[PDB]
């Protein structure tokens, strides 16, 4: 078959080539082989192959973003730049293919790209900057009012208030500091096992804390995995902060 | 006393040619305008000024004489250029004003000295008239990178990005675009972190209020 | 009293280089958020890191330590960018020393990572540091944890053929080579052939289709050459 293919020439069959991939399952490997063949001989058939097989071609599209723009002469032969702007750039931008910085770096990897594509990138960056500025302004406006209201409420609560100055246990206990409760030593019971001072021992084993810790760890791991898969595909940011806002610091 | 100085003060053809020759060069970090003037003077007059400079050096405290000399230089102006020889570092003897001459042909040092939050896009537009194939782009990139902290307004940043050249390679502006994007992302992340911290503080206050409610 | 004593310095003196350092001597802390909130407005990365680093000793029931560790990694990374921006804000030697101190801070970041490497391990630092570029820190972290899976891909993408070959030589999996030897052979068959010969543990049955593809490419190159037309073909035949 290899000898016949070497002898054979001037044959064009896009559909037959996909079905003649032996296992016909390695679509990514077939796309890589097609890119290698284009490196050997690029006749703009890569666009036809992408049109014929576009599903799950996000990685293929990312590779083509540099394959079709590897050479300025090849890019000019590849329908100049209108086709890439209409088909390649637009679909990649609208399909959330990758980060804007990654695309900018991939474009900067070349050295003979016209500024018209850079002009479209500048328009997209202007839109993104406007969105980011609006989001930052809204966040600051909310945060200032929230901080002012919280400070006022805390001041009112403190001024509002077994009445000696003391810090009550934040897990269901309260006592007067001047009544010798403060500074009881005993190594602070090692933070009292992250619980209020019961001032007594009732035995009955100890598994609630372990169960709570295991549940918290499992929930955090599941949330991180789901975010990376669906929500926080970019990074744990805006998700780790969200978990921190739930009160992970505890200190109760 | 001052009469001899007035006589010395009493006692602009090649200046235009020298200015044109200096303007011919379009280097981002060439010799300064004062440095270029000093080099031209060395190539070249100033001996009489040096004689006046000897009196000027002895006039380190004669404020009235300094003002009189500045007024005489203004009245003895030569193409509004020779005063720079008499005032190499005495621009306040007689800031919003040097750009007429310092920024006329080319002065990167003077541009940085007289830079500001406003009157920035106009300077970039004026410098864009170099019409070089790539030297103009390189000079614009150097000017942007030199004072990259000057631009700190969203509207100003948008206006600056709008007037970018449309025939320049993306590689030259790639570093600036990446820096701007990174700065914007960092600012957004900082704002989000501050909001999360404020929410955590509000939750702590709410927990304290709930505990107080439990306390009776 | 120690907390109250540091309050006066924080309110008026504001010398967190010593006040927070003195405040860092506290054994147990409760108002961490309140202290951080005031320190947040100060925007002093060093002061925030000093309190956070000491607070990392509070192991607790793990899990949340990673959340604190993520902020610790970000704080140092954010400080480096601020220092880099300040370094790039030149308009000298101390700044170069600060840049050297930034390398020392990077060494401190490596030292901080080395000390608690087992404590903080979620692969999120790689994602966190990726968004801010700075590939040197990512490479150092990859060298810290012996995986080389992402390191090999990064080296292949960058184009360091010699470094990629050196990394692949140490790897004894022989499956990654059997998968991606085609690109390496196409890039430099001469070095690849010697590397494969010296590597051993590579069955000739594998890459047979790759060998055929390499022969076809060599013939295509030879279609327009006379003297060294079959040079890649000669290398493949010799291998």
UniProtKB/Swiss-Prot annotation, chain A:
Transmembrane segments: none annotated. Keywords: Membrane, Metal-binding, Protein transport, Transferase, Transport, Ubl conjugation pathway, Vacuole, Zinc, Zinc-finger. A zinc finger (RING-type) spans 162-200. It is found in: Vacuole membrane. One of its GO terms (molecular function) is protein-macromolecule adaptor activity. GO terms for cellular component: CORVET complex; cytosol; early endosome membrane; endosome; fungal-type vacuole membrane; HOPS complex. One of its GO terms (biological process) is organelle fusion. It comes from the Eukaryota. Present with 1200 molecules/cell in log phase SD medium. Component of the homotypic vacuole fusion and vacuole protein sorting (HOPS) complex, which is composed of a core of the 4 class C Vps proteins PEP5/VPS11, PEP3/VPS18, VPS16, VPS33 associated to VAM6/VPS39 and VPS41/VAM2. HOPS associates with phosphoinositides and the PX domain of VAM7. Component of the class C core vacuole/endosome tethering (CORVET) complex, which is composed of a core of the 4 class C Vps proteins PEP5/VPS11, PEP3/VPS18, VPS16, VPS33 associated to VPS3/PEP6 and VPS8. Interacts with PEP3, PEP7 and VAM7. Belongs to the VPS11 family. This is E3 ubiquitin-protein ligase PEP5. It comes from Saccharomyces cerevisiae (strain ATCC 204508 / S288c) (Baker's yeast). The lineage of its organism: Eukaryota, Fungi, Dikarya, Ascomycota, Saccharomycotina.
Swiss-Prot record, chain B:
The gene is VPS3. Belongs to the VPS3 family. Required for sorting and processing of soluble vacuolar proteins, integrity of vacuolar morphology, efficient segregation of vacuolar material into the bud during the cell cycle, acidification of the vacuolar lumen, and assembly of the vacuolar H(+)-ATPase. Present with 2270 molecules/cell in log phase SD medium. It comes from Saccharomyces cerevisiae (strain ATCC 204508 / S288c) (Baker's yeast). This is Vacuolar protein sorting-associated protein 3. It comes from the Eukaryota. Transmembrane segments: none annotated. It is found in: Cytoplasm.
Curated annotation (Swiss-Prot), chain C:
Transmembrane segments: none annotated. It comes from the Eukaryota. It is found in: Vacuole membrane. Present with 2020 molecules/cell in log phase SD medium. Required for vacuolar biogenesis and for trafficking of hydrolase precursors to the vacuole. Mediates transport at the vacuolar membrane where it may be responsible for tethering transport vesicles on the target membranes. Acts as a component of the HOPS complex that acts during the docking stage of vacuole fusion. HOPS is an effector for the vacuolar Rab GTPase YPT7 and is required for vacuolar SNARE complex assembly. It remains bound to SNARE complexes after vacuole fusion. Belongs to the VPS18 family. Component of the HOPS complex which is composed of PEP5, VPS16, PEP3, VPS33, VPS39 and VPS41. HOPS associates with phosphoinositides and the PX domain of VAM7. Interacts with PEP5, PEP7 and VAM7. This is Vacuolar membrane protein PEP3. It comes from Saccharomyces cerevisiae (strain ATCC 204508 / S288c). The chain holds residues 369 to 612 of 918 of the full protein.
